[PDB]
Write a protein that binds this ligand. Structure first.
Ligand SMILES: Cc1cc2nc3c(=O)[nH]c(=O)nc-3n(C[C@H](O)[C@H](O)[C@H](O)COP(=O)(O)O)c2cc1C
Ligand SMILES: [Ca+2]
Lengths: 139, 313
C-alpha cells in the first residue's frame, strides 16, 4: 500500500519528480474550490512558496511556505492522520528559506521531514526517495 | 470578447498594426503563475543602501592587495553581466511575452538587475580605492575570456528567434554568474565580508525567480511546437550550454589563477548549469560528485541544505 500525496503549481516541477518515483501518487488540486479525501497512509511531497521573506525581527518568515491547497488538504483531520512523513522541494538560491515547507509541515503534523530536493529532481533524488518511502512504509 | 479581437500595445508596435490596442487587464488574469511571480518580486524590492557593508572593513583590510583585486575584478565582471541583462536581455523579453502581466514582470526584472549591478558600486564605494575600481574596469574591458561570454549571448537578444532569446534570458541568471558568486560565499565561510554576502543573497533571491520564470515561459512555447522542432530546440539548448560552460571554465581558470578556487567555482557553476536545465524541463546529466562543493561554503548559500491563518490546527 505505498502511496504519495503531492502538490504542484501550473509549473509542474514537483508533478514531474513524483511521476519518476515507483509509488502510486494522488495530486492535491490547484483549484481552491476542489478538495480530495485520502483514506490510506501516504508520504506528502510539496514545493515551497515563502519567496525568501524575512520578518522585522530578522528571521525567515515561513508565511506561504506551505501552499494554501496543502493547508486545506491537511486541515481535514481524516486526511491529516494518514501522513507518515513529508518531503519538501524548492531551490537552494532561496538560502535560509530553502525547502522550508517541509520543516513547517513536520512541526505542525509531528511527522519526520524525510528528504529535501530541488525542481524536477536528479537520478540520485529518485533513487533516494524511492528507498526512503519504502523504508517509511516498512518501519 | 474584446481580448480576442485586440492586441497589447507591444504586439501592435512590433508585430501587428491591423488591430486596435487593449489596456492590460489585472482583473481577468490568463496565468495565475504571473500574479504569483509579480507579487513576490515586487514584495522583495530592495536597494543596496539598506545593507551597510562598512562592517566588512575589518575583514576586508586583513585581505592582501591580490585578494582585494580578485574581489574587485570578480564583482566588476558580474556588474558587466548584470548591465547586459538590464539594458538588453530582460527588456528584449517584453515584446515576446505570452501574457500581458509577463510584459510588466520583465520590466521589473530589467530594473532589479540594474539594482544588482548598482549594488557592486555600493560595495566598492565602502571598501575600494579609486585605483582598485578603475584597474578592475580596465581588466574587464581587456579580458577576452570574460568578454567572450556576454558576446555569445547578446546576438540571441537582438535576433528574431524569440525561443533562443528566452533560453539566453534563462541562462544568464540561471548559470553564468555562479562562478563569481562562489567567491563571496568562500570568504563569508571564513567570516570575511559577511555583509557583502547578504547583498549576494538578496541578488540570488531575485535571480532564482528570473531563471524559473524565463524557464517556465520557454516550456509553454516549446510544448506547442512539433516533436521534430522540440528535439531541435533541445539540441540547441545542450549545444549552447556546452559552449557557455567551455567559455566560463576558460574565464574562471584565468580569474582564480594563483588562488586555487577555479576547481570549486567550476563545480558550483555546473551545479547551477544543472538547475538551469531542470527549469527548462530537461534532466541534468551532472553527477552529485561533479557538482559537489565544500560543506562550509554551501552552508553560506543555504544552511537548510543540511553545525556551520487558514491552518485549523
Ligand atoms: C514565487 C516563488 C517563490 C518561491 N519561494 C521559494 C522558497 O521560499 N523556498 C524554496 O526553496 N523555493 C522557492 N521557490 C522555488 C519553487 O519551490 C520551485 O520552483 C519548485 O520546483 C516549484 O514546484 P512546482 O512547479 O511543483 O510548483 C519559489 C518559486 C516561486 C515562483
Ligand atoms: Ca526555482
Amino acid at each position: 500500500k505505498e502511496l504519495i500525496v503531492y502538490f504542484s503549481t501550473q509549473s509542474n516541477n514537483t508533478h514531474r519528480f513524483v511521476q519518476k518515483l515507483d509509488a502510486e501518487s494522488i495530486r492535491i488540486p490547484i483549484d481552491e474550490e476542489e478538495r480530495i479525501k485520502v483514506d490510506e497512509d501516504y508520504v506528502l511531497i510539496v514545493p515551497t512558496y515563502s519567496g525568501g521573506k524575512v520578518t522585522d525581527a530578522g528571521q525567515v518568515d515561513a508565511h506561504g511556505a506551505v501552499p494554501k491547497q496543502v493547508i486545506h488538504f491537511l486541515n481535514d483531520p481524516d486526511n491529516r492522520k494518514h501522513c507518515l512523513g513529508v518531503i519538501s522541494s524548492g531551490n537552494t538560491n532561496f538560502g535560509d528559506s530553502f525547502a522550508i515547507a517541509g520543516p513547517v509541515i513536520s512541526y505542525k503534523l509531528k511527522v519526520p521531514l524525510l528528504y529535501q530536493f530541488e525542481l524536477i529532481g536528479t537520478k540520485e533524488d529518485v533513487e533516494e526517495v524511492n528507498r526512503i518511502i519504502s523504508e517509511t512504509f516498512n518501519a | 470578447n474584446y481580448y480576442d479581437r485586440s492586441v497589447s500595445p507591444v504586439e501592435y508596435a512590433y508585430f501587428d498594426q491591423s488591430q486596435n490596442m487593449r489596456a492590460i487587464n489585472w482583473n481577468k488574469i490568463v496565468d495565475e503563475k504571473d500574479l504569483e511571480v509579480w507579487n513576490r518580486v515586487t514584495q522583495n524590492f530592495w536597494l543596496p543602501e539598506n545593507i551597510p557593508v562598512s562592517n566588512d572593513l575589518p575583514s576586508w583590510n586583513e585581505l592582501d592587495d591580490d585578494w582585494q583585486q580578485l574581489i574587485t575584478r570578480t564583482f566588476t565582471g558580474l556588474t558587466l553581466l548584470d548591465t547586459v541583462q538590464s539594458s538588453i536581455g530582460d527588456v528584449a523579453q517584453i515584446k515576446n511575452s505570452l501574457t500581458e502581466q509577463e510584459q510588466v514582470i520583465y520590466a521589473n526584472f530589467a530594473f532589479m538587475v540594474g539594482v544588482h549591478a548598482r549594488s557592486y558600486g555600493t560595495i566598492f564605494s565602502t571598501l575600494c580605492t579609486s585605483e582598485q575600481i578603475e584597474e578592475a574596469h580596465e581588466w574587464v574591458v581587456d579580458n577576452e575570456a570574460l568578454q567572450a561570454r556576454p558576446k555569445a549571448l547578446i546576438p540571441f537578444y537582438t535576433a528574431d528567434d524569440p525561443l533562443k532569446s528566452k533560453i539566453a534570458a534563462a541562462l544568464m541568471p540561471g548559470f553564468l554568474l555562479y562562478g563569481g558568486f562562489y567567491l563571496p560565499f568562500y570568504l563569508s565561510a571564513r567570516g570575511k565580508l559577511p555583509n557583502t554576502s547578504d547583498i549576494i543573497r538578496l541578488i540570488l533571491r531575485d535571480k532564482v525567480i528570473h531563471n524559473f520564470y524565463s524557464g517556465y515561459k520557454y516550456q509553454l512555447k516549446v510544448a506547442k511546437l512539433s516533436p521534430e522542432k522540440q528535439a531541435e530546440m533541445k539540441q540547441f539548448v545542450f549545444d549552447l550550454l556546452d559552449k557557455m560552460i567551455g567559455l566560463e571554465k576558460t574565464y574562471l581558470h584565468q580569474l582564480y589563477d594563483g588562488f586555487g578556487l577555479a576547481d570549486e567555482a567550476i563545480r558550483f557553476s555546473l551545479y547551477n548549469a544543472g538547475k538551469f536545465l531542470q527549469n527548462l524541463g530537461y534532466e541534468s546529466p551532472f553527477t552529485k560528485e561533479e557538482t559537489r562543493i565544500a560543506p562550509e561554503v554551501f552552508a553560506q548559500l543555504s544552511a537548510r541544505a543540511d553545525f556551520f491563518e487558514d491552518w485549523d490546527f
